[PDB]
Design a protein around this ligand. Structure first.
Ligand SMILES: CC(=O)SCCNC(=O)CCNC(=O)[C@H](O)C(C)(C)COP(=O)(O)OP(=O)(O)OC[C@H]1O[C@@H](n2cnc3c(N)ncnc32)[C@H](O)[C@@H]1OP(=O)(O)O
Length: 328
């Protein structure tokens, strides 16, 4: 084992290592999937602000005193899994065993932390979209992982220079409803409704958990655009939608989920929300051209509604699991 590679914990206040890790990512992305390039604010931020009720176990591996690879695990409280958020080898040092060594490290950490399975997201090909590097899938299989049975993510791209869903402007707001907007922090009055929109003083635990996500994203320098639909006669939150923007990459943005309350369906609110919030976005983020989103592949309509707005299916986010295995 030892000699060639050194395992070192990745720590936010370690400027040099952190720097070499940002560079590794930058270098890797040049020959990785289609993606917004890593944002350094977002990435250094991901070392200071963890998601709620989640422990981060981050590592770097070195050859000759330099970072040649990285492993980040997310450990959700209570759960028996360890999510592999990053397992990355310098693109000029692949096929020497590093990945294998990182993966043995991941299992040893899962085991130590009382987790029985590792999960990962692996980029693969869509049945008829553009062929993707098969390496990461063959690595996964070779580590002993299996394709899980939860349906994969259909990962889509809208490109505003090839289609403008706003060509006819934003549609008419249906009678009885008004629109509202907010930024990175949910207004006090919609906190509870947002959190319940898709379902005592258990609301506080909920509201507080959501607030930790919102601050995580700000800590990571992300801006966010929300549009809400309100039912005037009841003042109920009928639906909302969002878009997330990293400090980096002025041309890129992330399209979030669109939610519409069960009792307010049938009024094209979903398309209204998407279109109106996009208008909102471009007004403050005029350089945005490339918007990404992802849906459960098994839900064709939601995907279709996105296609109608010009998002095209690009690549496939497949879920894998593996056993942490015995310590003994
Ligand atoms: C669950 C996961 O972690 S999936 C991987 C997620 N990470 C990424 O996609 C990030 C971008 N890619 C990378 O960093 C690298 O391509 C990754 C992580 C494979 C790193 O792998 P490396 O360090 O190059 O591979 P490594 O040398 O450790 O092991 C490869 C073993 O797995 C398989 N394997 C690894 N890469 C490949 C590949 N590109 N094509 C085919 N088989 C591969 C082979 O069986 C290989 O066996 P060995 O050479 O005798 O033949």
């Amino acid at each position: 084992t030892a000699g060639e590679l050194e395992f070192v914990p990745l720590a936010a206040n370690d400027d040099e290592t952190v720097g070499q890790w940002l560079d590794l990512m930058a270098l890797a992305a040049e020959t990785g999937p289609r993606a917004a390039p890593p944002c350094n604010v977002d990435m250094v931020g991901s070392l200071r602000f963890a998601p709620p009720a989640t422990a981060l176990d981050d590592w770097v591996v070195r050859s000759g005193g330099r970072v040649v690879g990285a492993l980040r695990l997310a450990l959700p409280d209570g759960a028996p899994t360890a999510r592999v958020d990053q397992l990355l080898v310098h693109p000029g040092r692949r096929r020497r065993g590093i990945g294998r060594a990182l993966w043995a490290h991941a299992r040893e950490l899962a085991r130590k932390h009382d987790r029985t399975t590792l999960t990962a997201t692996v980029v693969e090909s869509l049945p008829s979209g553009p062929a993707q590097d098969p390496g990461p899938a063959a690595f996964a299989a070779a580590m002993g992982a299996h394709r899980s049975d939860i349906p994969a993510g259909t990962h889509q791209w809208l490109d505003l220079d090839r289609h403008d869903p706003l060509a006819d402007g934003v549609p008419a707001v249906p009678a009885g409803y008004s629109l509202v907007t907010w930024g990175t922090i949910t207004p006090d009055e919609y906190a509870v409704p947002v959190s319940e929109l898709e379902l005592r003083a258990a609301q506080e635990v909920r509201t507080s958990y959501a607030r930790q996500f919102e601050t995580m994203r700000v800590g990571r320098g992300r801006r966010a655009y929300h549009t809400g639909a309100v039912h005037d006669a009841t003042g109920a939150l009928a639906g909302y939608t969002s878009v997330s923007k990293t400090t980096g990459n002025p041309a890129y943005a992330l399209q979030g989920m669109t939610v519409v309350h069960r009792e307010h369906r049938g009024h094209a609110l979903g398309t209204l929300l998407k279109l109106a919030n996009l208008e909102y976005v471009l007004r403050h983020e005029p350089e945005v051209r490339l918007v990404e989103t992802a849906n459960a592949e098994d839900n064709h309509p939601m995907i279709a509604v996105n296609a109608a707005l010009g998002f095209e299916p690009y690549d496939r986010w497949v879920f894998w699991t593996a056993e942490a295995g015995p310590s003994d």
